[PDB]
Design a binder for this molecule. Structure first.
Ligand SMILES: O=P(O)(O)OC[C@H]1O[C@H](O)[C@H](O)[C@@H](O)[C@@H]1O
Lengths: 636, 121, 242
């Protein structure tokens, strides 16, 4: 009889101390909320990344009796068990907020057991393992070294119930085991995507013709069968199966053959300002930095008003189709036409921030920004001169024939010498006849073959004066150390007016989510995990008021989706300053729903769905009755 | 040979066919300009902290007229900021300051550059 | 009594016969101004030294990216002038911050000053409430507090207008227009108007405090005024902002 109240929690994943993908950021940002609950009853388990862990971990001495509480001794003796059997591992705390306890297993000092385990796996579950697949190899290693540890802990401990949460198939190996070996631990499996899902979408329909795909064939078809088997196994073994979004919970049911018990959306450690309107002041400051870049980029061709200019951006890994760079650019070309037809006076500058092979900034980019800087300095000099002449007049009035309190003639303030140098500054900003502002800020390694650049050229967005939409490709991550747009990413977002992320395969929209928390409106899609999460929370029309524009990519045809994207953009362009300000306030208030202080409750429902499925009895006794166990939502 | 600690920077200002300034020349100047700007920000913060100390002495447990510990004046965010501008100034290991500020039309046959390359300055 | 960490600086802005600002008032602001200017010069010098270190690292024996010892940044001439600046701000032994910014024509007979003396708020370190009588209308052109009245109001946290006779509260209303909470009485036109316009005990949530001076004896009134102020002093910046 174990306590369903005071229990333990173990969370396992490949990214437990090495930044590989989005999962690292999820586990890290969740730390504070879960360490606040479990204190020392919580542990993270992952493979020891020998090359990096030393910068990430606070390596501690697990040997001391003072390195554990009394009721936590079991773990200390289970770690000793592994130590007798020759297993190397690192104990300590992540060097992040919340300082969660971490257990990193050196897979090297276990690799010998490979051939034995591999075979055992192939015969107990039916999971092949080609030698060359180092990933599945290290997966099996980890999987066994984990089940090993867990099994011993369940053995050494008799008070606490034990919850074992696993993230992604790379850490799902230990799940089929626990089920077989009948270990006494409740297990949860979360998948942040699906193997079949990615690969099917890696070519060119899916969200429609997928209910009827043959899972086992496509697996082999892609050469992913063994990997797929671990995902399915893990998915079936665990007490509670979950995904990160509803849209992924759909593909998981049809491609892993098991309707998930619920959703565990990704939250953020949202840092809030003492003054709610502060994010608004930040927007204004950050935008002036963008303004400064823009003047440099459009030098000699600066014919629009920045006070009447909107900044759109898309950002993420360079996945032309999957992130919808193609929709984004095609939509902007159509937006441009609409704005010119309708006689709009507004200007849209669009940024594409996706890392591509480049030889750094162009000379033109650096040159332009320098020449603007030179003009600023010359203006500053001229004005301190003007100031001294205004001051003299003022303190001298009404003597010496001064009849007016203030100068009335520009000639009194602006002298010949001042005019000469200002004019030389203006001359330096002039660009060759017929030359236009570039559509890219860097020298590309392979310009002719770049997808973004080809698309921009195809739709002919060349930053002509008559173009109401301007295009800027910045093929590199944003960094405040950069010479021309010296902003970190979060600073740049704050300064913009609208994010546009027309994704196709996106189990969770990290980007739109970040963007919302910055108090910036964004366009996402219903096939994006963030989008699907948002349209279940607010009615798709009401959503727009909150700065959430959801494009339909599941049910509309592609040209329909594009026109809808254009519609949204145009609707946003027509807003006034006051409406933009109010909208941002609204989207910023939304941000609280993206915080772990709320999202973290789902991780709670999942752990209790497993504690009620694991020991339905001690839960009928601890609650007084038995409640519905078909959902995470049914139990609450 | 004379153990002199002086340095001579020699400038050759003679027009030759070129494709304008190198990216390196422009980038370096911008990188230094950015360090300068950040330093201005930090010293503004420092001034605030020196002023506060100066105006409230000797109350609230201030035993000295001035701060004595750099840590009272220089915060960790100030340091992260400065260390980043320093990192941006770092050259690829083994790389030396160039002997020319421009991209040359016919670099390989330039009399002056070939002379510099021959005497190995 | 509650050992609060807060400090209230209280301003009385009512015109009285005066012979203008005290030399002390002008002298003190000039001396604070001189300290700021001197600090600017020092930070400029500190700047160049941080910059040199940063641009030079890691050559010429610099083992750290940044200076670690203050002595590298702050030199003797810098210290000397900063201390001269500090000395000029020192006031005579046992001298306290004045309760008035002007030279009164008739200081001994003044009702406001006599009251402050009677209650004994002389701006001592142990006093959690400070007192400043500025017996002149505010104006952006005056040498010590260069703010027009509206600017001054916006900068404050709380208007306190405990009126006995006041057909209409221009002041608390003007105060309200600028998002500054205030304290009024139910015998002022503004107070009586707001008493009716807003649900009884909601006014405080909107920053309108109404003291009952109609159906309470003066002592009860005062203690309610104090209740209000003490309640406001308890607020967080967040609460004050909302
Ligand atoms: O960039 P916009 O949408 O035009 O917003 C501009 C507004 O941004 C913030 O709200 C600032 O606090 C306002 O001063 C500014 O006018």
């Amino acid at each position: 009889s174990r306590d369903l109240q005071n229990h333990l929690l173990f969370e396992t994943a490949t990214e437990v101390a090495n930044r590989v993908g989005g999962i690292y950021s999820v586990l890290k940002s969740k730390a504070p909320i879960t360490v606040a609950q479990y204190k020392d009853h919580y542990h993270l388990i992952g493979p020891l990344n020998k090359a990096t862990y030393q910068n990430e971990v606070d390596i501690l001495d697990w040997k001391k009796p003072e390195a554990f509480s009394d009721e936590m001794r079991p773990v200390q003796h289970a770690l000793q068990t592994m130590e007798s059997r020759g297993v190397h591992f690192v104990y300590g705390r992540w060097l992040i907020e919340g300082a969660p306890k971490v257990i990193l297993f050196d897979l090297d000092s276990v690799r010998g057991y490979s051939n034995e385990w591999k075979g055992d796996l192939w015969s107990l579950v039916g999971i092949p393992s080609p030698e060359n697949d180092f990933e599945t190899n290290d997966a099996i290693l980890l999987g066994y070294t984990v089940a090993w540890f867990l099994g011993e802990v369940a053995h050494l401990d008799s008070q606490h119930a034990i919850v074992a949460h696993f993230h992604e198939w790379l850490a799902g190996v230990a799940l089929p085991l626990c089920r077989k070996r009948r270990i006494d631990v409740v297990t949860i499996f979360t998948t942040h995507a699906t193997l079949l899902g990615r690969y099917l979408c890696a070519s060119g329909d899916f969200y429609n013709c997928l209910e009827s795909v043959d899972v086992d064939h496509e697996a082999g078809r892609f050469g992913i069968y063994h990997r797929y088997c671990i995902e399915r196994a893990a998915a079936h073994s665990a007490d509670v199966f979950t995904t990160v979004s509803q849209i992924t919970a759909f593909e998981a049911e049809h491609l892993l053959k098991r309707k998930p018990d619920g959703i565990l959306p990704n939250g953020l450690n949202v840092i809030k300002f003492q003054a709610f309107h502060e994010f608004q002041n930040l927007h204004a400051l950050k935008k002036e930095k963008i303004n400064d870049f823009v003047r440099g980029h459009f030098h000699g061709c600066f014919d629009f008003d920045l006070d009447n200019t909107l900044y759109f951006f898309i950002a993420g890994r360079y996945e032309y189709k999957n992130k919808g760079a193609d929709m984004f650019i095609e939509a902007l070309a159509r937006l441009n036409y609409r704005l010119k037809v309708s006689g709009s006076k507004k200007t849209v500058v669009a940024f594409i921030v996706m890392p591509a092979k480049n030889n750094s900034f162009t000379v033109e980019a650096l040159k332009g920004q320098a020449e603007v800087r030179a003009l600023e300095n010359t203006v500053h000099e001229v004005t301190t001169s003007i100031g001294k002449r205004i001051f003299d007049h003022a303190i001298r009035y009404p003597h010496n024939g001064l009849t007016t309190e203030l100068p009335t003639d520009l000639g009194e303030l602006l002298k010949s010498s001042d005019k000469v140098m200002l004019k030389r500054r203006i001359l330096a900003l002039r660009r060759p006849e017929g030359q236009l502002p570039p559509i890219v800020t860097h020298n590309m390694v392979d310009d002719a073959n770049d997808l973004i650049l080809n698309k921009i050229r195809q739709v002919q967005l060349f930053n002509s004066p008559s173009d109401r939409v301007k295009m800027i490709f910045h093929p590199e991550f944003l960094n405040a150390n950069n010479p021309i747009l010296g902003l970190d990413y979060d600073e740049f977002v704050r300064g913009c007016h609208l994010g546009v992320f027309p994704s196709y395969y996106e189990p969770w929209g990290y980007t739109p989510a970040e963007c919302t928390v910055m108090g910036v409106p964004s366009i996402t899609t219903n096939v994006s995990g963030f989008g699907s999460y948002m349209e279940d929370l607010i009615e798709t029309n009401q959503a727009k008021d909150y700065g959430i524009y959801i494009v339909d990519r599941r049910f509309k045809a592609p040209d329909e989706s594009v026109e809808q994207l254009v519609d949204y953009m145009e609707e946003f362009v027509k807003k006034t300053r006051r409406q933009r300000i109010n909208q941002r306030n609204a989207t910023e208030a939304l941000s609280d729903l993206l915080d772990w202080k709320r999202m973290g409750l789902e991780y709670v429902k999942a752990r209790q769905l497993a504690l009620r499925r694991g020991y339905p009895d001690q839960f009928r006794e601890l609650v007084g009755e038995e409640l519905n166990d078909s959902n995470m939502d049914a139990l609450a």
